[PDB]
Every structure is written in C-alpha cells, then in structure tokens.
Design a protein around this ligand. Structure first.
Ligand code: SF4
Ligand code: SF4
Ligand code: SF4
Ligand code: FES
Ligand code: NA
Ligand SMILES: [Zn+2]
Lengths: 66, 114, 89, 39, 209, 677, 100, 54, 62
C-alpha cells in the first residue's frame, strides 16, 4: 500500500531534490509544539475529509416560549 | 419619428411577409426528415405544432428590419437542422422538456416562495 | 462519533437534530486542536523600559510589517498582527 | 535625491490621439514607412 | 535621461503622420477623420459605406499596398447610438507598417462584407456576426462559428450577462443533455474597482463637443 | 455681484467674488486633492495638500482657503504643483503606522487613494532603522467609535464637526509639535445622536465604526441605495450588502433631506435586523403556546376567524409599516366591508382633511434659512436629529432666534424657555408675550410643534391657534406652520385615508384585529374583547407578537421595496438589499394572499399593479423624490427628552445588541460620575 | 431596470467615480448554499451593470431592448456655497469658532 | 522589474518596512493600476505565427 | 524515486501560523481580491480577544 504521500515533510524536500541536505544534516528545521505527524491521503475511506461551513448562523429567530 | 436606414434583405413589408412564408414552407417540408434522422420522442404532428406555436411568438413584430433578422436567424437554424450539425439534444431544446411548469396563480407562487 | 459534537474554535457546530450531520456518517469532521486563541494567551508578555517598542513578527522579512506600540497606558498592549503582548514597568 | 516621480513617471505623459488633418490647419509621395524587400 | 519612460519612435511617427494625411485627400467621400494614436499607430475613421472602397484602396494603391489583413475586432459600446464598432488591422509587408480602419454600425444596419478585398475576412466576419450580432451583407455564408448550435443571443455584447441564462446537465430520464435556467452555487462576486480620484488629467478636458 | 474672470489651467471661468480657488476649479471639473477641507465644515488650512501654483506669486497658495482674485492663472497640473503634493505625501506618510492590512479604511482610504494619484512611489524615510516612527496612545471614546489614534493625520475634521455640527465641544487638540494629539484630555464618552458621522469624516482609519469592525472590505460590498425608516426624516441611505447580509448603513448624499449626515439610530439599526426575527408562521394552539406552521395552514387558520368574525374587523398600522402594505390592509378590510382602519399614533380629529395639517410645510432644507423658530413640546435634538442639525446651521449662520414651550432641555445651542404652561401658546398667539414680537418681525418665522402634543387631548385647540397664527406670519412663498412627525408610517397612513389613534380600533370591539408591524405597547390583550383573534404581521417578534394569536412573518425594510413618506411629504422608495430570512414574505404579499383564502381577490397581483392603485388614491404619491406644496393649514410634557431614551424606541432598535451597549455605556458613566462626587 | 447615478462613497471625498449613469436590475433572491454556505442565486441579470452618459441615452437603450425602466431623480446641481475663511473669526456673529 | 511601484509591485522586504511600499502593494493587488485610455495592437513572432492582442 | 522539483513549486495550499502558534492570517482579504478564479471566500469577525481574524476561509480547489 505504499503511496507517494507517505513521505513525511522532514524528508520531503530532500526527496524531491529541493535541497541537497538531509534533515539530520541541517539544523534549520523547526520543532514547534503544534506540528502534526504525517498522514496519508485518505480518500474513499471512513477517515476522509468532508467540508462544512465554519460560521455559526447569523440571524437569530425569536423564541415564543420565552 | 422616422429615419433613413439601409435595408437588411427586403424593402417592403410585403416582401418581408413573402420571405417569412418561405421559411415556413422549408420547415414544414423538413419535419418528416427531422423525425427520422433524430432519436427524439416527438412526432411530426407534435413538431408541426411547435413550428406553428413559435411563428406565433413573434405575432406583434412590425419593423421590417426586425422581421429580416428573425428570418436570417430562422433560416440559419434550418440549415443547421437540414444538416445534422445540431445534435439530438439541440432539437429537443425547442420544447424545454426538462423545465417543469411553474404555477402562475398568486396563491401557489406565494406558498412555493419566490 | 466524538468529532460530530465537537465545537470548533470559530464557535460553530451542527445541532444534534440538524440533518446536515448526515454528511459525516461516512466521513470525519477534523476540528483543529491547536486553537490560536489559547496558544497566544499562553505566551507571557514582554516587559520593556522604553516608552515605545516595535514588533515585526520576530523574523524581519519573514514576519509581519513593522508596527510600533505606545506603552504609556498601564495595561499590557497587544500587537495587531501577531497578538504578542507588551508592557512597560 | 532628485528622484521626483513627476519626471520619471510615464503614465501621466501620454496625451490623447492627435488629429492629423487639423493639426496642420492649426499649424516623393508619402508612404506608410520604409520599403522592404519581401519579394 | 529617464529610463522608465518608453522612448517614442519619431522616425516611424513622422512617416505615419504624412501618409495619414495622404489618405485623407484620396478618399474625401468616406474618411471622416484620421488620427495618430499615442502608441504611434495610425487610425482611419471611415463612414459605414466606405468599408469596401477604403479597404480596396489601401490594398491596391502603390503607396499603400496593405496587402495583409490581420484582424477584424468588434467593440460594443452601449452609450453610443451606433453601439457596435468594427476595427480592421492591416499590415503592409512591402512598407513594413500597420494601419487601423474603424467603422460604426447599429444593431440592425448591415455592414458591407470585405471578403472581396481580403478574403481572409471570411471567418473574422463570421465571428463578428456570432459574437456581437453585426450582420454582414453579401457574405458567402454567414453562420455562427464559435457559440453552441442553437445558442440564442450574442454573448459579447456588454448587455449580456456573464454567465448566460442557461446551463447544461444530463437528465437520465431523457437519456440526453438538457438545458435549464442558470443556477450558480456561488455567485460571481463583483468588485467595485473604481478610483475616486482622477489620475490622468490630460484626458479630463479631451474631446470637446 | 458681477462674475470675476479667472483661468484655471488656462481655461477661463466665471465666479462670484469671494469664491475659493478650490471651488473655482470645481466648476471646470478639476478636483484638487484635500484632507482638511470639507464642504460642510469650517475652512481650515492644516493639511496643506490643496496647495496650488498661481502665476507670478512668491509661493503656493492653499486652494481651500484662498479667495479668488481677478485675472489669476491657477496652475493645477504644473511641475511646481506636482512637487508640492509629492512633498506633503512624503510628509504625511512618515509616521502613519503601516496598518493597511488591519485597518478598516483599507480600500476606502483617502490617504491611500491620494497617495497613488499624487504622492511619490518611493520612501526616503531612512530613519525607520534608527529611531522608528511615532506611536500614540489610544483613546476610549465609547461603545460606538473605535479609536486608533496612531493613524490620525491631524486633519481636525473630527474636532470641527463636533464643535460646529453636533455642538458638543468635548473633543479637541492637546499638545504641540509631533506630540500633538486629538481627543478628550480626561476619558469621557462622546455621547451624541450624531456621533456616528465622525466615523465618515475621519479620512483615515483613526476613528472607525466599532460594531462593524473587520466585518468586510469595500471592494466586496454591493451598494444598495435605500432610505431609513427608524426616523421620520426619511434620510437617504446606502445599505452595504455582501452575500445576503447587511453589513453597515452609510449616508447617501441628498441636499434636500439628508445632507450627508445620519443620526445614530439609523446608522446602528443594522444589528437589530439580525435578532429576534420572525422566521415562520406561528399559531396559538388550544393549550396556549405558539407553534410554527406552514403558510397554507396559517392563512387558512386566519381565514376561519375572518369568516366567523362577520365584519367586525379592525386594523392598526404600526411604526415601521409600509405604504404599499398599508394600502393592501385597507383594501382587504374594505372588501370585507369593514372600515375601522387606524394607526397607532393619535392625532387631531378631522386633521386628515388638509395635507398641510400634518407635515413640515417648511421643507427640511427651508428651515436652515429660518430666522425665528418656536418649538412647542418638541425636542428635535432627539425626536428628529437631522432637523436639529439644520436649526443649528441657521443658528450659527442665519442668526436664528429660538424659543421653547415645555420642559427644560438642551438643544446643542442657546434657546429661551418660555415655560411649560399650556396657556403660553395662546399667549404667544395673542401677541401679548414678549417673544411674539420676534416672530412677527422676522423675514422667515416658523413654528414647529411635536406630533406627540397634537395626539394629546388638548391638541385640537393648540393645533387651531398656531395654525390660525401662522396665517398672520405667512409670507410670500413661506409656510410657517410645521408639524414634526416621528414615524415613517404615520404620514403615509393619513395620506391614504387611515383614521388616527389606536383607540379608533378598540372602540369597535372587533372580533379580529390586524397588527401590521404595530409593536408599540399601545394595545394590550386586556383591552381586547375576550373573544378576539389578534393577527400580527411584522418582522420582529416583540410585545406586539407576544399577544398575537397568529403571527405571520413579514420582511424588514431592507428586504422589501416599499414607499415611505417622510415628514415633509417626500415619497421615497426602499430597495431590497437582502433576501428575507426563513419563510418570511413581504407584508403586502401576505394580505394579497390572505384575500384568496377568504375569497375576495384584490385587484392587483404585482407591485406595479399595486402602485397604480396608489396612483388613483393620491397622484402625488407616485412622483418619487418630489414635493407638492400644501399651501395653507386649517402643562406640555414630552417623551424622549433624555439620550438614554433615544436608542430604544423601535422594535428594530430595541432588538439591537449595539444599542444595549450604548444604553449601558451612558448609564455606566452616570453611575461613576456621582460615585466620585 | 433602475437608471441611476452610482452613489458617492460617503467615506471618501473623491467624485470621479460618480461621473456616469448606470443601469442595475432588480435585486432578486439569494440563499445560503446547502453544502458550504456560500451565497447562491439563479439570477443571471442580477450581476449586470452598464454605463451611460445621460438618462436620455439610458432610456433610449432600455426602450430598444424591451426592458421596463424607471429613472431615479437626477441629483440637482449643488447650490453655491460661500465657504469664507475670515468669518471663522467674527466680532459679533455666532460663526466664530471656539476651536482651531 | 521597472522601478515604478505604481505599475509593478514593490519588494516584499520593502513592503514590511516602508509605508509607501505597503500602500502601493495594497492598491496594486486590490484595485490594480490604472491604464490611460487608449487602444493598441502589439504583435510578436510567436512560434505558431503572428500573435496579436488588440 | 521522484522529483526533481524546485523550492518555488506551487502546490496544495496551507495557512501558516507564527511560532507562537497564533494563525498568521488577519483577514486582510488581499488574497480574495486578487484570486483570478475567485476561488477564495473569507468572512472575518472581531475575535473574543479582540484580534482581527477569520471565522471562515474556504478555497475551492476545483
Ligand atoms: S488610514 Fe488605514 S488604510 Fe489608510 S493608509 Fe492609514 S493604515 Fe492604510
Ligand atoms: S482623528 Fe481623524 S478626523 Fe480627527 S484630526 Fe485625526 S485624522 Fe482628522
Ligand atoms: S486574508 Fe488572505 S492575504 Fe490577508 S492575511 Fe489572510 S491569507 Fe493573507
Ligand atoms: S485642504 Fe487646504 S490645507 Fe487642507
Ligand atoms: Na474613518
Ligand atoms: Zn507583531
């Protein structure tokens, strides 16, 4: 099940010749606490994405009960 | 309020009336061929009505130049239909079959919404 | 699942009766966990001495435009762009 | 210094089309340009 | 002295100015106006009837020899009474020059086809009829060239909605594609890109009445 | 006098002597850049952006302030003028705080647009890397106006406006040199009904709308010219819309009515249209609660009441009601035979006979020329601020003399208080009173009487005396008598044939009652017969809905094209910027539809068909944006005297979250003030 | 079809963007998009806008295409305004400014 | 690029620093630049032939 | 094996954030206005802490 998308971003540049320096040999890589582990492209799966509006509705309807 | 202009195809309403009838001839002759050469539900009598129905749309037209243009465009479609450049879909486009009726009465439109 | 009822940082969520949850029965609802409102709140303010200071996002040309802030008021002052807080004491 | 935009700028220097017939009145046969041997 | 400003080509400007007048004398009946554009390009504004004469003159005269017809652009301007303008871009290989001939027509009035002079305008005129609705009399066979068969209207008129009136979809009842009134998931979001401050003062007083 | 000759860019012009260079160039069509000059504020020469060359003069002359002198050759687009403008832009843009991405004015900013058009492209300010720019502390001016003073360019538009138009004199300039700052020395609230207009004067993003903060950008907006209805003045409006929502409301220029100003209640009602809104038809179940139901069900449920009512029907127009909806309500009730069609506001009996009895016969523009004004039971500073703005304009310029009859108030300018006694009005009419001499001498006297007083029981006598007195003061082409209305619905209703006063409907004891946008508390469920069916047709669920037996949702003024008649009599048309929410429909559509289920279809099925019915009842109502002169007209206590009472007067306003903050803010300051003392 | 002059932006002093007459169609319905919540509409002409030099041309264009039209009242040319500077410093008049 | 920042966007580093660069960047991207009224026909020797844009 | 590419390569989109963790985007909407395809939709609101931020940021990759 190897995919082109299993390559983590650490090595991604080195693998596409964007750089000649592997991640071990460079100290310019950041280590922020909010970085996330890699993931496949999940399509045709129960783990896939699905878009949704990110805004709560604007107009409030008058409540007769109170 | 009149102005001098260059004629399109005809010089008189009578000539324009003469041209329009010819377009009716050629279409009315052509319906039997269109039914055979197009895989469409409509029959000759139904189509021959559609020809009558639409020539009636432009019932109140008066300007000869406008009548010329309708006959220029009207003729262009016939050549595109005498030929089969127009595909099966395009011919049935004259009926708007997909669009379902929209009621006209006020109460129905109000309930259905704008 | 859990993700359906999770409320995003923008404050939106489909009601438990809303039909629009139907879209998630065969998929997931990624709600980001690194809420910016809390991470910036975590970073403590920077005490200064001068009356006005500048923040550029921290990395010059890779940061945001250089803006200057005036620290005369008591309350610690937020940068418009990065959200960092400054204070004079 | 001495870099005022009012000189360097080109947009504000374009003028409307010039009317050839009138601008004489207010003021070998001709050819569109120079002959070329396209043969 | 100033690198950013483009340098005008005076020698090419000089020839076009004089030859521009030359046309004005040879064709008084048709040439309404001759003007040298800011791009050092010559424009010859003719009456609607002088299309075939003027085009013939430029192609056949020794001095003109504008043998090569490059384009026929149509421009719609609802403000004007004769809203449709038609522009011919001609090239003269022997003299290495370009000239523009413009003419104006209404929605209905026909425009004399120039297939004769330059029969490269066989399709260009077909396009103009299709896109704008300008009819060309004496054309070999005028007919839509770009739009769909049975497409109603003329899309490039400024009075035509961008998205058109009807979309296409496939209807499995009818086993064919059907046309329905247009329905966009997201509207075309306009942007009001209008500057409140005039920037080009040279054109403020231009074109006196 | 005689036109003076002056040449701007070598084009001759004729100007009356005294005209400024800036105005003279306007006639040609040349717009000199400006920051401090504003057409409706006192002239100042702070910005120096308007500098312009003059042939044979030692130095540039400020166009805004220089009065034209004969023979001059002004040179707008010369090399010297261009260099001057570039210099000032290079000067203005040193200390501007580099905030365009986070600045509300972006895409709408004068400092941006004039920088492109005239300023230079580079920046010579090398000193960013050594000492930095300037940064100024922020000010807490109130809940309506956000304040980021670092962006101020010290144009003093705000200061001049607050001192001259609003007349508050709470804003000002402190310090000198670079350390100059604009704002209150001690933190205060800039409390004025006209406070919003500052947000439009400040050409940069220093002062800006707080409720609207960050909501959108200019280029996105689709502008929809409309009118305001929260106030009787009928000010023109441009409702900014983007993707089916009203973002803000801006003043549209209209010399005769609006004057580019706009009272706050109009400016901050856009929040009220997003709260407590009616979405679906609702019906009283047998238990007593309301449940939402479909339209076909609701109209049939109401239809049962109408048939069982048997002619004892009455209607009550509301505050935000529409002319077209009001006419439908009248026709529908006439088809049933009923004639009890009233409004909420009471009025002099028999007053609808003459159209001059309930209008500002002196047009809104006409007041600014006034010379002696008598305000009877009217606080125009709050009842209708845009009129007060005109009175102050006369007071500053035309040397207006003012007097009052009622409780002591402040109008934002000096005025005499004759006392609150009822008998005063007969004294002034009788000529015995001292101020009576003032009115009989002035060349443009006017008498303004609040519409509230006329509703009072005494009103008929009071309306008679002043309407009798005006005929003496009446001067060629001037109609002194003036009634000041407070509802956009009232004038239209009386103009169509409605009776006045909600008691015209209670006195009929109807078994069915229509509350068309009638959200005042004037009617109560006790006063109704115990067998009654209240049908409320409105936008916002409020006390009006709280009593209703069958609530039908209507559309608010931003989602319905409707005619409104402002106080002076101008008919004006709203346009729908936003689709109505939920299953809401236009007000007249319901009544037009409700006749079907009752059986008496109305003559019209489209707006144009409806409008022609108005064209037959009152021909002038069709001629939009016009006025028809009406010729002759044939202890006082006031509501709405405090600023606290100004914000909460309408259903839309009462539902506004913003106006809740303003009420708390005004109360907050008062609580703190007494605490310190 | 509404013939009108585009409204000047109150938040600016420039005017050269209101030097035309325009046509804009009725403001037909829009609704929230069920999937993503965008604004949706089935109103092709609602997107439309054309510019003209005078209402007479605008009416002429509207008649030639069969549209129903109505013209907003052309803004009357602004009355002359004095705008003198010296009056800001007046001896007995109220125009004297208390600020500067 | 040509120097004129009123036609061409300015450098990013200058955008973060100088006020004029930020205004021009803001306007060149939202509103774009104003081209003087006029018409032109330029053509080139595109590989297919003469490619022109009126 | 795959590539080669260059650091300028244009691919899938992503909203960065500051090293603090706070999102960089301030809902200036320049990106929306310049997008030739109008593929971007942004709705911004005054955040609880009072910072200019987006409550919506959608890209229609199709
Ligand atoms: S006022 Fe705002 S938009 Fe205008 S230049 Fe200043 S920061 Fe930029
Ligand atoms: S706050 Fe605004 S209006 Fe007042 S002086 Fe400063 S820039 Fe001018
Ligand atoms: S709105 Fe777009 S351009 Fe502006 S900060 Fe956010 S991502 Fe960048
Ligand atoms: S507009 Fe004249 S100095 Fe400001
Ligand atoms: Na402002
Ligand atoms: Zn920062």
């Amino acid at each position: 099940d190897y995919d082109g998308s299993m390559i983590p971003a650490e090595w991604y540049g080195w693998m596409h010749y964007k750089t000649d320096l592997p991640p071990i040999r460079d100290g310019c890589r950041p280590k922020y606490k909010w970085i996330a582990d890699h993931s496949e492209n999940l399509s045709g799966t129960k783990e896939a994405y699905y878009p949704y509006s990110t805004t709560p509705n604007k107009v409030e309807a008058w409540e007769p009960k109170a | 309020a009149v102005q001098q202009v260059r004629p399109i195809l005809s010089v008189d309403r009578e000539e324009a009336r003469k041209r329009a009838l010819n377009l009716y001839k050629a279409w009315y002759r052509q319906i039997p061929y269109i039914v055979m050469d197009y895989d469409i539900p409509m029959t000759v009598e139904q189509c021959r009505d559609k020809l009558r129905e639409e020539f009636v749309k432009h019932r109140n037209v008066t300007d000869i130049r406008v009548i010329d243009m309708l006959v220029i465009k009207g003729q262009m479609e016939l050549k595109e239909s005498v030929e089969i450049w127009k595909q099966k879909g395009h011919i049935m486009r004259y009926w708007k079959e997909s669009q379902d009726p929209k009621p006209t009465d006020f109460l129905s439109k109000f309930i259905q919404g704008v | 699942r859990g993700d359906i009822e999770k409320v995003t940082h923008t404050g939106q969520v489909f009601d438990k009766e809303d039909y629009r949850n139907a879209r998630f029965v065969n998929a997931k609802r990624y709600v980001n966990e690194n809420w910016g409102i809390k991470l910036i709140e975590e970073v403590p303010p920077k005490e200064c001495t001068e009356r006005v200071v500048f923040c550029d996002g921290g990395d010059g040309p890779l940061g945001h435009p250089k803006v200057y802030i005036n620290l005369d008021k008591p309350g610690n002052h937020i940068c418009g762009y990065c959200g960092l807080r400054f204070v004079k004491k | 210094s001495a870099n005022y935009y009012c000189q360097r700028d080109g947009r504000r220097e374009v003028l409307p089309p010039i009317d050839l017939v009138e601008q004489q009145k207010q003021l070998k046969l001709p050819t569109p340009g120079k002959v070329y041997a396209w043969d | 002295d100033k690198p950013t400003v483009r340098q005008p080509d005076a020698v090419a400007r000089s020839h076009l100015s004089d030859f521009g007048r030359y046309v004005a004398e040879c064709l008084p009946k048709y040439v309404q106006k001759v003007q040298l554009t800011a791009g050092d390009e010559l424009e010859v504004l003719i009456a609607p009837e002088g299309v075939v004469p003027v085009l013939q003159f430029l192609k056949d005269h020794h001095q003109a020899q504008f043998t090569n017809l490059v384009d026929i652009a149509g421009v719609d301007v609802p403000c004007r009474k004769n809203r449709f303008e038609v522009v011919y871009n001609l090239l003269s290989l022997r003299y290495n020059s370009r000239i523009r001939v413009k003419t104006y027509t209404d929605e209905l009035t026909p425009l004399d086809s120039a297939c004769e002079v330059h029969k490269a305008a066989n399709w260009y005129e077909r396009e103009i009829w299709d896109m704008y609705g300008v009819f060309f009399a004496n054309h070999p066979d005028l007919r839509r060239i770009l739009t769909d068969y049975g497409f109603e209207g003329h899309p490039q008129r400024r009075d035509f909605p961008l998205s058109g009136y009807v979309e296409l979809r496939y209807d499995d009842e009818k086993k064919r594609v059907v046309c329905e009134p247009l329905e966009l998931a997201q509207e075309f979001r306009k942007f009001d890109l209008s500057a409140p401050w005039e920037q080009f003062p040279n054109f403020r007083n231009a074109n006196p009445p | 006098p005689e036109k003076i000759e002056v040449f701007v860019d070598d084009i001759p012009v004729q100007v009356v002597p005294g005209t400024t260079v800036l105005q003279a160039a306007a006639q040609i069509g040349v717009e000199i850049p400006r920051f401090c000059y504003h057409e409706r504020l006192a002239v100042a020469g702070n910005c120096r952006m308007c500098l312009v060359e003059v042939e044979k003069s030692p130095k540039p002359v400020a166009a805004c302030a220089m009065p034209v002198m004969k023979g001059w050759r002004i040179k707008t687009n010369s090399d010297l003028t261009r260099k001057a403008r570039e210099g000032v832009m290079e000067f203005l843009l040193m200390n501007h705080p580099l905030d365009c991405p986070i600045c509300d004015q972006g895409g709408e900013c004068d400092l941006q647009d004039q920088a492109m058009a005239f300023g230079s492209d580079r920046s010579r300010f090398t000193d960013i890397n050594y000492t930095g720019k300037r940064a100024v502390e922020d000010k807490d001016i109130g809940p309506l106006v956000k304040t980021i003073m670092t962006r101020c360019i010290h144009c003093t538009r705000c200061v001049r406006f607050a001192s001259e138009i609003a007349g508050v004199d709470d804003l000002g300039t402190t310090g000198r040199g670079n350390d100059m700052q604009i704002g209150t020395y001690v933190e205060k609230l800039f409390l004025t009904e006209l406070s919003g207009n500052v947000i439009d004067l400040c050409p940069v993003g220093a002062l800006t709308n707080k409720p609207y903060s960050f909501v959108a950008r200019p280029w996105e907006i689709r502008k929809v010219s409309s009118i305001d209805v929260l106030d009787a003045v009928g000010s023109n409006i441009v409702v900014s819309t983007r993707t089916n929502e009203v973002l803000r409301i801006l003043p549209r220029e209209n010399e005769d009515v609006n004057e580019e100003w706009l009272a706050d209640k109009s400016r901050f009602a856009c929040d009220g249209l997003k709260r407590q809104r009616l979405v679906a038809p609702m019906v009283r179940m047998p238990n007593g609660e309301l449940q939402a139901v479909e339209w076909e069900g609701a109209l049939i449920a109401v239809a049962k009441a109408i048939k069982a009512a048997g002619g004892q029907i009455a209607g009550i127009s509301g505050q935000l009601a529409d002319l077209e909806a009001q006419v439908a309500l009248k026709d529908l009730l006439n088809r049933l035979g009923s004639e009890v069609v009233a409004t909420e506001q009471g009025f002099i009996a028999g007053g609808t006979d003459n159209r001059a009895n309930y209008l500002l016969n002196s047009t809104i523009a006409g007041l600014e020329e006034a010379d002696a004004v008598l305000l009877v039971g009217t606080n125009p500073r709050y009842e209708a601020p845009l009129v007060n703005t005109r009175l102050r304009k006369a007071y500053v310029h035309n040397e207006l003399q003012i007097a009052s009859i009622g409780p002591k108030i402040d109008l934002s300018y000096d005025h005499e208080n004759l006392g609150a006694d009822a008998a005063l009005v007969k004294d002034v009419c009788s000529g015995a009173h001292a101020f009576s001499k003032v009115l009989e001498g002035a060349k443009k006297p006017a008498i303004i009487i609040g519409a509230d007083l006329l509703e009072r029981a005494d009103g008929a006598a009071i309306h008679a005396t002043v309407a009798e007195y005006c005929k003496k003061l009446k001067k060629p082409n001037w109609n002194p008598f003036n009634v000041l209305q407070t509802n956009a619905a009232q004038v239209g209703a009386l103009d169509v044939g409605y009776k006045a006063g909600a008691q015209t409907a209670v006195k009929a004891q109807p078994k069915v009652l229509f509350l068309l946008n009638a959200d005042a508390g004037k009617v109560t469920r006790e006063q109704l017969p115990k067998d009654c069916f209240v049908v409320y047709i409105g936008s916002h669920g409020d006390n009006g809905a709280s009593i209703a037996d069958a609530v039908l949702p209507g559309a608010a003024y931003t989602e319905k094209q409707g005619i409104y008649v402002n106080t002076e009599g101008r008919p004006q048309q709203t346009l729908p910027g936003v689709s109505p929410p939920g299953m809401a429909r236009e007000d007249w559509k319901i009544l037009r539809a409700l006749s079907e289920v009752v059986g008496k279809p109305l003559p019209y099925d489209n707006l144009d068909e409806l409008r022609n019915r108005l064209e037959d009842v009152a021909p002038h109502l069709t001629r939009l944006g016009q006025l028809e002169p009406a010729g002759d007209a044939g202890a006082i206590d006031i509501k709405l005297k405090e600023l606290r009472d100004y914000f909460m007067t309408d259903a839309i306003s009462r539902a506004s979250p913003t106006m809740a903050k303003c009420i708390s803010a005004v109360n907050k300051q008062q609580r703190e003030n007494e605490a310190k003392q | 079809v509404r013939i009108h002059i585009p409204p000047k932006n109150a938040m600016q002093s420039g005017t050269d963007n209101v030097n035309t007459w325009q046509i804009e169609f009725d403001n037909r319905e829009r609704w929230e998009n069920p999937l993503m919540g965008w604004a949706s509409s089935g109103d092709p002409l609602s997107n439309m806008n054309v510019q003209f030099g005078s209402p007479e041309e605008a009416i002429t264009f509207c008649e030639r295409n069969g549209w129903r039209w109505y013209v907003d009242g052309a803004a009357k040319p602004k009355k002359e305004r004095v705008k003198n500077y010296g009056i800001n410093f007046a001896w007995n008049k109220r125009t004297r400014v208390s600020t500067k | 690029k040509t120097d004129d920042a009123k036609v061409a966007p300015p450098s990013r580093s200058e955008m973060k620093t100088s006020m004029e660069a930020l205004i021009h960047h803001f306007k060149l991207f939202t509103q774009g630049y104003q081209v003087p009224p006029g018409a032109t026909y330029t053509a080139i020797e595109a590989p297919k032939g003469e490619f022109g844009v009126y | 094996e795959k590539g080669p590419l260059s650091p300028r390569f244009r691919g899938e989109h992503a909203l960065r954030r500051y090293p603090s963790g706070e999102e960089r985007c301030i809902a200036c909407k320049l990106c929306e206005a310049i997008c030739p395809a109008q593929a971007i939709t942004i709705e911004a609101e005054e955040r609880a802490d009072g910072s200019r931020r987006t409550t919506r940021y959608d890209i229609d990759m199709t």
